[PDB]
From a paper:
First, compound 1 was co-crystallized with PvNMT and S-(2-oxo)pentadecyl-coenzyme A, a non-hydrolysable myristoyl-coenzyme A analogue,26 and the structure of the resulting ternary complex was solved by X-ray crystallography. Overall, 1 adopts a binding mode similar to the original hit compound, 3-butyl-4-((2-cyanoethyl)thio)-6-methoxy-2-methylquinoline (MRT00057965), which we identified in 2012 by high throughput screening. The quinoline fits into a hydrophobic pocket, where it establishes parallel-displaced π–π stacking interactions with the adjacent side-chains of Phe103 and Phe105. The binding of the quinoline ring is reinforced by the establishment of an H-bond between its nitrogen and the hydroxyl function of Ser319. Additionally, the nitrile function of the 2-cyanoethylthioether chain appears to interact with the imidazole ring of His213 (distance ∼3.0 Å). The ligand is modelled bound to the protein at half maximal occupancy due to the low affinity of binding. This is mirrored in the two orientations of residues His213 and Tyr211, corresponding to the bound and free forms. Interestingly, the ester function, introduced to improve the solubility and log P of the hit compound, also establishes polar interactions with PvNMT, through water-mediated H-bonds. The X-ray structure of the complex between 1 and PvNMT shows that a cluster of water molecules surrounds the sulfur atom of the thioether chain. Superposition of the three quinoline–PvNMT complexes present in the asymmetric unit of the crystal shows that the ethyl ester group is flexible and able to adopt different conformations in a relatively large pocket, suggesting that the ethyl chain is suboptimal and that the enzyme may tolerate larger substituents.
N-Myristoyltransferase (NMT, EC 2.3.1.97) catalyses the transfer of the fatty acid chain C14:0 from myristoyl coenzyme A (MyrCoA) to the N-terminal glycine residue of substrate proteins. This co- and post-translational modification is ubiquitous in eukaryotic organisms and plays a central role in a variety of cellular processes such as the addressing and reversible anchoring of proteins to membranes. In particular, NMT has been validated as a pharmacological target in fungal infections, in a range of parasitic diseases caused by Trypanosoma,7Leishmania8 and Plasmodium protozoa and filarial nematodes, and as a potential target for the treatment of cancer. Herein, we report the synthesis and the structure-guided optimization of a series of quinolines with balanced activity against both Plasmodium vivax and Plasmodium falciparum N-myristoyltransferase (NMT).
Author numbering: 26 to 410
Write the structure that this text describes.
């Protein structure tokens, strides 16, 4: 492809490769005073809108746009269906900016037809910590595709981020764009196998009959780490220490403050689940996963796939395998149908033993305005929503 938008942006060209001695911006010495103060032009009949995600009705508009128009799998079986409470959690992290939650309305109907968002975070890339924006939830209504609206949303959010003297961003996508810093496949561990077969995701064969599949994926309802329990506010200092220490080994990770640990990990039912093991007043192990249902397109029995996605997991008292077997059990106890994980951090090491299957996509990780060496996905230490 020609990437005629992306080639105007400060990202690597498709054949660029940089060695470990290079870890810097494409464009440095940027000046906030020089940033354009005018909003980017939209086509006639469309207007910018600043969404207030803490207002239930604006949030509901974003929820409806994404439910009807967001990411589908390659096979068009599923569309992601982030909940409105999830959107509130994802977008109102510490020191978030309302003005980075950008909608576009079609004036004649007053309906939201496009969205993009970012939140601020400190990202460590090859041992250099940089303030970045983490961009997510880019969406154009399905009736307005291939009209070049996405570059207008990208340029408008870049402008507003640059007004805060932030000049780098991190983002992920299942599409290939110039140019990933790493690329991680999805893997899935079936929990409710019969439902996964019925909706057309999992398969059977003459060796693996339905009863044999159910037995294969059966799990014992006993934790390997007996005192794993939901995280509470008392555990924030300990989680900050256990996770922060663990993440320092990776080539790309977020540098969480204590306030960020409280926001990203304290549990919210049907949104984020974090469990900890406390021994002697120290947090020695943690499991976390978030809820991301998919709408099952056209299905008359099931409308929703409830899926848990692995977030951050660290063990110092058990094996990683035993930890992840406990995460699958915790997701099963919370009614999830499947447990999904990327091949980042230590995860790929347990996929075969814990009977995960390889999915069809991969998720590519990108930086904006940063040149550096790429690296294998076990050296990625960040999970975006
Ligand atoms: C310093 C601050 C920096 C801040 C900004 C950082 C960068 C943030 C970047 C955003 C990160 C978002 C991360 C995130 O949200 C997580 S990835 C999920 C993105 N959302 C979806 O896939 C939802 C369903 N699809 C859509 O809504 C549309 O297809 C979208 C809106 C995706 C494209 O709408 P469209 O109607 O299909 O297409 P046009 O308007 O005609 O636009 C065509 C151009 O858009 C480029 N494109 C397509 N998909 C992209 C994607 N996923 N990222 C980046 N760029 C993407 C494409 O390559 C082409 O450019 P090119 O001609 O050069 O090839
Ligand atoms: C059954 C296992 O879960 C998925 O395969 C799944 C479900 N819903 C989606 C909706 C949109 C979608 O867009 C790529 C993918 C999925 C996927 S695969 C990649 C995410 C994971 N795991
Ligand atoms: Cl322009
Ligand atoms: Mg378009």
């Amino acid at each position: 492809i020609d990437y005629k938008f992306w080639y105007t942006q400060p990202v690597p060209k498709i054949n660029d490769e940089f060695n470990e001695s290079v870890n810097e911006p494409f464009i440095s010495d940027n000046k906030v005073e020089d940033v354009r103060k005018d909003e980017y032009k939209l086509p006639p009949g469309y207007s910018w809108y600043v969404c207030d995600v803490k207002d239930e009705k604006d949030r509901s508009e974003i929820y409806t746009l994404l439910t009807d128009n967001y990411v589908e799998d390659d096979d068009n079986i599923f569309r992601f269906n982030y909940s409105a409470e999830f959107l509130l959690w994802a977008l109102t992290s510490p020191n978030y900016l309302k003005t980075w939650h950008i909608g576009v309305k079609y004036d004649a109907s007053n309906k939201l037809i496009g969205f993009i968002s970012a939140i601020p975070t400190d990202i460590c890339i090859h041992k250099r910590t940089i303030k970045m924006a983490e961009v997510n939830f880019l969406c154009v209504h399905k009736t307005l595709r291939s009209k070049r609206l996405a570059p207008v949303l990208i340029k408008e959010i870049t402008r507003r981020i640059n007004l805060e003297n932030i000049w780098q961003a991190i983002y992920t996508a299942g599409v290939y764009l110039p140019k990933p810093v790493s690329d991680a496949r999805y893997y899935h561990r079936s929990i409710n196998v019969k439902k996964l077969i019925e909706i057309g995701f999992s398969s059977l064969n003459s060796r693996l009959t339905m009863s044999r599949a159910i037995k294969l994926y059966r799990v014992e309802d006993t934790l390997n780490i007996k005192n794993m329990r939901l995280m509470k506010k008392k555990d924030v200092e300990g989680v900050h220490k256990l996770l922060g220490s663990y993440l320092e080994q990776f080539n790309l990770y977020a540098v969480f403050t204590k306030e960020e640990i409280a926001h990203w990990f304290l549990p919210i039912e049907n949104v984020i689940y974090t469990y900890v093991n406390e021994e002697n007043g120290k947090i020695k192990d943690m499991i976390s996963f978030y809820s991301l249902p998919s709408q099952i397109l056209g299905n008359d029995k099931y409308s929703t796939l409830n899926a848990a996605y692995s977030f951050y997991n660290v063990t110092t008292t058990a094996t990683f395998k035993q930890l992840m077997q406990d995460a699958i059990l915790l997701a099963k106890r919370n009614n999830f149908d499947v447990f999904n994980a990327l091949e980042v951090m230590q995860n790929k090491s347990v996929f075969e033993d814990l009977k995960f299957g390889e999915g069809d996509g991969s998720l590519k990780y990108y930086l904006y305005n940063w040149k550096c060496a790429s690296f294998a996905p076990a050296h990625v230490g960040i999970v975006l929503l």
